[PDB]
Amino acid sequence: GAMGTKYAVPDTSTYQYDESSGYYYDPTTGLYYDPNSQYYYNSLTQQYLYWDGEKETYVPAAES
Amino acid sequence: GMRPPPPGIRG
């Protein structure tokens, strides 16, 4: 729990289309993405995520 | 149900 956190902007073309929700799912990273809600989510961690950019990692969009 | 859904899931 120190290294491995080298992420960046996900590849939008790598996402496939989920018809039920109407949004993108990327099999390679396991990321969910909606350009409208602008939030991501990684189901491998089961976390609703958000690309900060500065932290170079996916921060949970679980604002409480 | 399962994991969460893709961002949105509106109506």
Task: For B8, list phi and psi in degrees, rounded to 5.
Answer: 125, -90
End-to-end CA distance of chain B: 19
Residue of A nearest to B7 (CA): A34
**Residue A16 host element (H or E):** strand A16-18
Please tell me chain B's helix, strand, coil percentages from 3-state DSSP, rounded to the nearest 5: 0, 0, 100
> Domain map of chain A by residue range?
1-64
Please check whether residue A48 is in contact with residue A60, taking contact to mean a CB–CB distance below 8 angstroms.
yes
Please check whether residue A34 is in contact with residue A25, taking contact to mean a CB–CB distance below 8 angstroms.
no
What's CA A27's distance to the chain center, in Å?
Answer: 11
Judged by a CB distance cut-off of 8 A, whether residue A16 touches chain B is no
Give chain A positions within 8 Å (CB) of B5.
21, 32
The method recorded for this entry reads NMR
